[PDB]
């Protein structure tokens, strides 16, 4: 028999300096940390899209209940939770006629239809942004049903060109009862989860409008956190491999910084998911200067993690550019290595947080599983564990595992208990997906509002 150690779940810091574990439960009792006075919305869609959006925005002003309020907590309402005013009356509207949509989607092509639709929506948004007096914080693109049947990434990149926050909302999400189809049953019924949809939409809107929902408190001061993800831009001419990063360091005191580190550094080879010495030096220097500009001092340790191994050709450059006594640690997080642990007695899966330590440099973290607080499973069937390996450098495995849970506890795009992998990798992948569809953007913004 082999023993599995347990890692206590991390705690996130909400308003008033109080700690909790579930964001859905900590936002209701205490609330967000910062004060934004209100969200002035903007809609770019058909007039029926405007009606749907206003109906939904009026519906979410009052409490909404789920079927199970232990697994899925209820929603008090936007103003009760966040202390803001996101009303359905201070709404700026830019209409798209059905004639334009039909003209641009009738036959055309595929790469021509998508380009034309993106041009139409972006022309409306950018024109409203540059020549108008009314201030709009978040732009809500209500996409009809015939448009979503590639567009999202193009829209986000071509708006990234001008740094405008945006949120795409299909009409099936907000009016799921009307789009019956089939033989009388909705294609996606939300009847039992209507308190989770409101939670997720509200938290996304709050974050994209300059708000700070929660923050991490249990992480080592001084150390950085970089996550490298490689994407194949090889779909176009001159096949290459682009790399993207994301940094999560802590402020000089009582703060959390979570941005991107982009400028994607390419690789001319085909299967070489690695980096050249000069590009590695540039990446490390940029990250270190980003940390030093905020904390007015150099880091104490750099914690680089990725889904792939690190060769000796890049680590030498990394050590060449690192100054003073800034240590470096390389970690590799594989996801689908075939090890499944069952339970001898019971129909419920293994608890989340169990770690099986193979060697001093390897471990088996369990991120998905059974959460006692929700009394339900975070996944389906038997959960799969992630594999953590200290590739390059010297560090303790337990500290690495604690840091992995801490990173897992930082998803702003959705309001859930936790994820199944560190959020830095996921956000870097999102950034890479956005930047691949673009056309040679120079010095992109480092804020997740424009990407997420």
């Amino acid at each position: 028999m082999k023993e599995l150690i347990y890692i206590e779940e991390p705690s996130i810091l909400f308003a008033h300096g109080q700690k909790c574990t579930d964001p859905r439960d900590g936002l209701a009792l205490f609330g967000p940390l910062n004060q934004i006075y209100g969200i002035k919305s903007g809609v770019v869609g058909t007039q029926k899209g405007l009606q749907i959006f206003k109906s939904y925005l009026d519906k979410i002003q009052k409490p909404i209940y789920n079927h199970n309020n232990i697994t899925r907590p209820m929603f008090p309402g936007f103003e009760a939770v966040f202390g803001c005013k996101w009303e359905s009356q201070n709404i700026v509207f830019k209409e798209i006629t059905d004639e334009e949509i039909r003209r641009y989607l009738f036959n055309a092509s595929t790469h021509k239809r998508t380009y034309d639709l993106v041009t139409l929506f972006n022309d409306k948004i950018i024109t409203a942004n540059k020549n108008d007096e009314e201030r709009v914080d978040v732009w809500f693109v209500i996409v009809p049903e015939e448009i979503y049947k590639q567009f999202h990434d193009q829209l986000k990149a071509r708006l990234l060109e001008h740094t405008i926050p945006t949120q795409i909302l299909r009409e099936s999400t907000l009016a799921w009862r009307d789009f019956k189809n089939t033989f009388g049953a909705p294609i996606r019924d939300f009847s039992k989860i209507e308190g989770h949809l409101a939670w997720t939409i509200s938290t996304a809107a709050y974050y994209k409008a300059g708000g700070k929902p929660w923050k991490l408190g249990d992480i080592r001061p001084g150390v950085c956190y970089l996550g490298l993800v490689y994407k194949k831009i090889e779909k176009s001419k001159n096949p290459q491999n682009a790399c993207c990063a994301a940094q999560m360091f802590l402020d000089n005191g009582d703060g959390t910084v979570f941005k991107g580190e982009v400028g994607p550094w390419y690789n001319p080879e085909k299967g070489e998911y690695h980096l050249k010495p000069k590009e590695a030096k540039a990446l490390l220097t940029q990250a270190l200067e980003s940390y030093k500009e905020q904390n007015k001092s150099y880091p104490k340790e750099v914690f680089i993690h990725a889904r792939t191994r690190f060769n000796d050709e890049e680590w030498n450059a990394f050590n060449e550019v690192t100054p003073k006594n800034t240590n470096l640690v390389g970690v590799t997080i594989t996801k689908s290595k075939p090890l499944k642990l069952y339970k001898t007695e019971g129909a419920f899966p293994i608890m989340r947080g169990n770690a099986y330590i193979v060697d001093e440099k390897k471990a088996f973290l369990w991120t998905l599983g059974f959460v006692p607080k929700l009394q339900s499973t975070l996944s389906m069937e038997v959960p799969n564990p992630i594999f953590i390996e200290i590739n390059k450098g010297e560090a303790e495995i337990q500290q690495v595992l604690k840091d992995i849970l801490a990173l897992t506890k930082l998803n702003y795009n959705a309001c859930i208990y936790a994820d199944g992998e560190p959020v830095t990798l996921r956000f870097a992948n999102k950034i890479g997906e956005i930047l691949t569809a673009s056309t040679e953007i120079k010095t992109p913004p480092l804020a997740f509002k424009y990407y997420i």
């Binding site: 599995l4 019971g346 899966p349 169990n354 006692p372």
Partner: protein, 411 residues
């Protein structure tokens, strides 16, 4: 210095928890039935300061709230205060003209539109009427939330034993052989499609055997056994310094795992199981005619999904770093008649995802264990005939794990 809240028990509950914790956060001692019969009547009389009643369709006719309201009215008629009862309207299907007596003459607060406005006006009313208070202690509204609502939802120091799918190898063949067999094996013969596990690896000295007798496939029978090289499978593993210029110790283990994964595939060809092809591996399943009542040891491995039949299938793969194991992965293979496979590859995904939604830890465990035990010849092992005299033995019982922190299973 207290505040009393009356409400229905099964309904109008979430509002009461929210309001109670919010008022405790700001420093208002509240006495609600959620946090904790004569005690209620004593608190309405000698302790409470403001009596709040929740109005709803579910309420407005419940006995307990009515009795508490009557007691509160009697206390109000003696305390000489006209603001002792403050109704809160938390419904939208009950009119303002259907409210019961004794409260129908009092102006409500209308929590109907939005709860934040109601809370703000409630606090303004409390500040105007000089309700006593203490400095805001936001910690307590977290402490009570943890104590009361999260009492049974935590991590217990409970011990459980966890099964796994890593079936270990008890014993290995003693000698790994390096035969020459020059000019007695054509350069065009594939070393695969041969009865025994063999591969042409390493600078000649090819045809890795683990046993002799590749006769009737390569009839030469004219080999001088002296030139053949023999290594020890004990030093090939555990870094026993088998690393030589002939073959280093890393390539040797990658070379053995190949023989294991070939031995499994050629052994399953002799059992009562058929094969299915996947993207990068093979899966084996049992037909419908075999097995009595479709159950091996009271565990069913084939059934019916509407007009189709479903089979349980497993794969395998060698591994050697932690310990010599055989990682088994579970699959479901769908057929049409019960013996004839379905050539779709597009409906089998939509049937696998359909069938695997009702299956949980128990079903997966029992079906995997039953399928593994079905193949075994010996009671506690399964035989892979790598050779005419040597074999690889895998345990029937998978590796077991155990922990010290756990949870109480739901009913």
């Amino acid at each position: 210095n207290k505040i009393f809240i009356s409400h229905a028990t099964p309904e109008d509950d979430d509002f009461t928890r929210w309001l109670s914790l919010k008022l405790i956060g700001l420093g208002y001692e509240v006495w609600c039935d959620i946090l904790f019969w004569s005690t209620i009547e004593k608190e309405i009389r000698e302790n409470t300061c403001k009596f709040l009643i929740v109005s709803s369709t579910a309420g407005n006719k419940r006995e307990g709230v009515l009795k508490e309201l009557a007691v509160a009215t009697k206390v109000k008629k003696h305390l000489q205060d006209d603001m002792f009862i403050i109704p809160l309207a938390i419904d939208e299907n009950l009119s303002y003209d259907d409210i019961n007596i004794e409260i129908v003459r009092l102006n409500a607060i209308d929590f109907k539109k939005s709860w934040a406005k109601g809370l703000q006006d409630l606090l303004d009313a409390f500040e105007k009427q000089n309700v006593p208070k203490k400095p805001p202690d936001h910690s307590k509204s977290n402490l009570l939330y943890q104590q009361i609502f999260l009492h049974d939802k935590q991590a217990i120091e409970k011990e459980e034993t966890y099964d796994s799918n890593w079936f270990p190898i008890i014993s290995f063949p003693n000698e790994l052989r390096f035969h020459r067999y020059d000019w007695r094996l054509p350069k065009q013969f594939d070393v695969r499609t041969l009865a025994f596990p063999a591969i042409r690896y390493k600078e000649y000295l090819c045809t890795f055997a683990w046993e002799y007798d590749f006769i009737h496939q390569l009839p030469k029978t004219e080999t001088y056994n002296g030139q053949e090289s023999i290594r020890i499978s004990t030093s090939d593993i555990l870094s026993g310094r088998y690393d030589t210029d002939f073959i280093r110790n890393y390539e040797c283990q990658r070379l053995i795992v190949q023989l294991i994964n070939k031995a499994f595939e050629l052994r399953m060809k002799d059992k009562n199981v058929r094969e299915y092809q996947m993207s990068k591996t093979f899966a084996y399943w049992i037909e419908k005619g075999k097995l009595e009542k479709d159950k091996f040891e009271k565990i069913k491995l084939v059934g019916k999904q509407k007009n189709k039949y479903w089979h349980f299938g497993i794969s395998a793969a060698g591994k050697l770093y932690p310990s010599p194991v055989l990682m088994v992965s579970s699959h479901i293979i769908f057929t049409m008649d019960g013996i004839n496979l379905i050539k779709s590859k597009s409906i089998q995904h939509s049937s696998r995802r359909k069938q695997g939604k009702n299956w949980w830890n128990d079903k997966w465990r029992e079906k995997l264990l039953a399928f593994i035990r079905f193949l075994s010849d010996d009671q506690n092992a399964i035989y892979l005939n790598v050779g005419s005299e040597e074999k690889i033995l895998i345990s029937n019982k998978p590796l077991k794990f155990f922990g010290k922190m756990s949870y109480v299973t739901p009913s």
